[PDB]
């Protein structure tokens, strides 16, 4: 069951995951295996968590502020942040979120793509 | 977003419906347009909605028990239930309910196919 299925035709993205904001701490329900690949982590460690994780030492706290009201908004957005893989490397991630709707205008999930820049 | 495909390739089914059991009542959050058609109902009806309205008057409630028993039991199961449209039309339901797990097992959503027979 690959939820990037559920995107645009136009849209064509390796790392991407998808939440549940109906769900305590807006978990990840669905991560393409480029994401698991791309940071270094198994299914386990990444399933059912909020993919705030990616950030680490040097992360701007108030570009997490604003990846928080960009989602409560309900809207694309697109930030460049400092993200780390499992390994502990840096990255900056040109980070692309978008809500996914129902047939009906509801929110469904939020997807996220990650794209090292 | 056609979350039938997260269904498999082999699968090709017209009315489908999906299904969150972590939200109070097991609420459908994705309907195929096959299913709206054939039932008549309108998206505002039935998204949000737990998809046992489908039952009517000379439905088994068994029945309706045995689905809410195989849905706790996370496992594919078929049953034919009389079922009701939104004019009140009676039709034989060859119901089939499958779980959709993430790739790590986790049980993501419920789907359900109606067959009319
Ligand atoms: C679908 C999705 C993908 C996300 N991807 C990232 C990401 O790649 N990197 C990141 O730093 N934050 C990412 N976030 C943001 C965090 O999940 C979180 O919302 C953010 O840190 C703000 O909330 P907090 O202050 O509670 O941590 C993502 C959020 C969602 C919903
Ligand atoms: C994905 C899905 C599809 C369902 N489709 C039908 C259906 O077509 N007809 C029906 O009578 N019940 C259907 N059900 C069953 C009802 O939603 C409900 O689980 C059942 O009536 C037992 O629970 P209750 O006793 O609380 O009503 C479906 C359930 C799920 C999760």
Redesign the interface.
């Given at each position: 069951?690959?939820?990037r299925?559920?995107?645009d035709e136009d849209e064509a993205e390796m790392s991407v995951v998808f939440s549940?904001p109906?769900?305590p701490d807006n978990p990840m329900?669905?991560?393409s295996?480029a994401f698991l690949v791309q940071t270094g982590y198994t299914?386990?460690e990444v399933?059912?968590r909020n993919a705030r994780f990616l950030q680490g030492p040097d992360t701007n706290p108030h570009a997490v502020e604003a990846i928080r009201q960009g989602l409560k908004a309900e809207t694309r957005f697109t930030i460049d942040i400092l993200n780390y893989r499992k390994d502990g490397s840096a990255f900056v991630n040109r980070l692309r979120i978008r809500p996914?709707?129902?047939?009906?205008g509801?929110l469904?999930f939020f997807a996220g793509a990650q794209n090292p820049v």
């Open positions: 069951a690959d939820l299925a559920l995107l549940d109906s769900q329900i669905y991560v295996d299914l386990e399933l059912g996914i709707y129902d047939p009906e509801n469904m």
